[PDB]
A = this chain, B = another copy of it.
């Protein structure tokens, strides 16, 4: 028999009772689906976690979906409870979903997540066939739905339908009034007639679901649509995004018929159209709510489009690196280029809610117009299939990129960022979606010229990439940070490390003195230096923090199209559901390191000589940068270009890695008893793998 069935029979007739199971045999996790925790008593002092998770264990005989007790949510937060792990259940309890007629829900009250399972069989049947239903929904609570395991803007599950194709509708007997006319007469007329518009901007999803509120699929997406008489902001309400979101895209002629015109929202701004001729309507807004007969939205095909209507054409503000160099800040633009680098999918905490996160990742889009790549801060645009599976050597096109500039720092910062109404599309060979635009044709011409010339731009994927480089002087660094939180204590650092969540990144500043720096030939005369101060105070340290370890996934690795899937999966966000690995995968140490140096280990003794720490120094600058003076100092972590070397062909005479390592060690030795201000980078790679890499050493 199966441990699942044994436990179920053991605790089936004692609902909501904590019962240690008779026998504990490891079970295999196969999925972790997240959803909102609702219908629980929030009066409790430890406010219930905002979200709860369902774990789909398997026992070799049957696989059953379990509801993890929210008290254990920290395990999923730190990615300890992965997919395909050998967890052992120490406590179990039953629970009946009164909103449904089914069986008990095995509740995992206590667990001991272990190691990976060598036998991950997804062919096992489901003990409770209700669990194996086509629409994958949460165990508890009416018509509940699942959210993306990490962020709230990524569509996830099966409710997100993608089967809305154009339909031929005859417009005879239809009025299709102009948007300006509607703006004039939306406060008097009763039956708002039809509208023929074209989507010009599609924005990310917005999850406004709150606990203990009678809300069903609380999603809203903002669409800007334009006709021959202006443009308006169209908003899709809950229960409509699931059916239409994955299908609606920019450039689709829609026929909205039964809508609701409201006064518009003052806390949300309407993006300016690419073509200024389009008159902007700001006093009006169109709300699309799900209706009984699904006719409120119709995707009119292009073939039916008549020039007589003169519908506005989807334009684009495509920009090239050279042009971007001359564009003021906050000047929206579009970028088409070749992905020559992709970074980890890091996460940041929303400033509004402490339990929500943004998923972002840095990518160096590049073109033939300049020698520097577009640095784009790619936040999730509710396009997980493209965002998660993005790889170098791909023609990438984003839609709405706000320009961000900072000239105070000596390394002038010029990186683009994705806006709310942005979009991501991967292009293939000649411009697939945007061939007509001349800039796309020029980019394709450059691609062909490079291909026939035998030149290939260097490619990288993943790694430790703290793009924003701290300024050259601590005063300028602190000009933005508050005085009370500017610095921390070497002792308090431990809590900072222990507070981060999956891929949450943090930057802290610590006051101390470099005591001993050691060089670790990383890839496959003096490498260690010790300070007399260290030899004296090493025996009187209260707590010597040891975080000078570099993980294999923090080393950027040169991309290889053949191992594309493996390389991508080694740096994406943790998948929600297990998927068996094709054949055997290679070793993450089997790929060449895009870096060009070995990592050092820096020991810092606090100003009071009581506490110490061991950070790891991971410079990303090549010796050519040293020779041409593209680095503020040898103790920094980035060259000014903030980009990896391209087709390195000039290291024949330049000092080798060992010479640069000796220079770095000597520079560190120059700071013997000097109170320096280190800038550390704390990133938690999940599964209790927190990397603490040094960024900059601000000397007096």
* A535: chain B residues within 8 A (beta carbon): 307-308
* A539: chain B residues within 8 A (beta carbon): 306-309
* A306: chain B residues within 8 A (beta carbon): 538-539
A540 at the interface (CB under 8 A from B): yes
* A96: chain B residues within 8 A (beta carbon): 607-608
The 28 listed contacts between A and B (C-beta, < 8 Å) are A13-B673, A15-B607, A15-B608, A15-B609, A15-B610, A16-B608, A16-B609, A16-B610, A95-B608, A96-B607, A96-B608, A98-B606, A98-B607, A98-B608, A101-B677, A306-B538, A306-B539, A307-B535, A307-B536, A307-B539, A308-B535, A308-B536, A308-B537, A308-B538, A308-B539, A308-B540, A309-B539, A309-B540
Chain A residues numbered 385-411 whose CB sits less than 8 Å from any CB in chain B: none
Using C-beta atoms within 8 Å of the partner chain, give the interface range for chain A.
Answer: 20 to 34
- Using an 8 Å CB-CB cutoff, how does the interface string of A599-615 with B read, 1 for contact, 0 for none? 00000001111100000
| A15: nearest chain-B partner, CB-CB | B608
Q: Which of A95, A535, A608, A677 has the most CB of B within 10 A?
A: A608
* A606: chain B residues within 8 A (beta carbon): 98
Chain A residues near B (Cβ < 8 Å) = 13, 15-16, 95-96, 98, 101, 306-309, 535-540, 606-610, 673, 677
Shortest beta-carbon contacts, A-B, top 9: A308-B539, A96-B607, A306-B539, A15-B608, A308-B540, A16-B608, A15-B609, A96-B608, A98-B607
Chain A interface SS verdict (over half) = loop
* A13: chain B residues within 8 A (beta carbon): 673
* A101: chain B residues within 8 A (beta carbon): 677
| A305: nearest chain-B partner, CB-CB | B539
Instruction: List 11 extra interface pairs beyond A98-B606, A307-B539, A308-B539, CB under 8 A.
Output: A15-B608, A15-B609, A16-B608, A95-B608, A96-B608, A306-B538, A306-B539, A307-B535, A308-B535, A308-B536, A308-B538
| A611: nearest chain-B partner, CB-CB | B98
| A607: nearest chain-B partner, CB-CB | B96
* A98: chain B residues within 8 A (beta carbon): 606-608
| A104: nearest chain-B partner, CB-CB | B607
| A97: nearest chain-B partner, CB-CB | B607
* A610: chain B residues within 8 A (beta carbon): 15-16
| A538: nearest chain-B partner, CB-CB | B308
* A309: chain B residues within 8 A (beta carbon): 539-540
| A96: nearest chain-B partner, CB-CB | B607
Nearest-neighbour CB distance to chain B for A535, whole angstroms, equals 7
Nearest-neighbour CB distance to chain B for A95, whole angstroms, equals 7
| A16: nearest chain-B partner, CB-CB | B608
* A537: chain B residues within 8 A (beta carbon): 308
* A95: chain B residues within 8 A (beta carbon): 608
* A538: chain B residues within 8 A (beta carbon): 306, 308
Nearest-neighbour CB distance to chain B for A700, whole angstroms, equals 9
* A608: chain B residues within 8 A (beta carbon): 15-16, 95-96, 98
Nearest-neighbour CB distance to chain B for A538, whole angstroms, equals 6
| A536: nearest chain-B partner, CB-CB | B308
| A101: nearest chain-B partner, CB-CB | B677
* A536: chain B residues within 8 A (beta carbon): 307-308
| A534: nearest chain-B partner, CB-CB | B308
Nearest-neighbour CB distance to chain B for A17, whole angstroms, equals 9
Nearest-neighbour CB distance to chain B for A106, whole angstroms, equals 14
| A540: nearest chain-B partner, CB-CB | B308
Nearest-neighbour CB distance to chain B for A539, whole angstroms, equals 3
Nearest-neighbour CB distance to chain B for A676, whole angstroms, equals 11
| A673: nearest chain-B partner, CB-CB | B13
* A308: chain B residues within 8 A (beta carbon): 535-540
* A15: chain B residues within 8 A (beta carbon): 607-610
Nearest-neighbour CB distance to chain B for A98, whole angstroms, equals 6
| A94: nearest chain-B partner, CB-CB | B608
Nearest-neighbour CB distance to chain B for A544, whole angstroms, equals 13
Nearest-neighbour CB distance to chain B for A139, whole angstroms, equals 14
| A677: nearest chain-B partner, CB-CB | B101
| A700: nearest chain-B partner, CB-CB | B101
* A307: chain B residues within 8 A (beta carbon): 535-536, 539
| A41: nearest chain-B partner, CB-CB | B542
Nearest-neighbour CB distance to chain B for A303, whole angstroms, equals 14
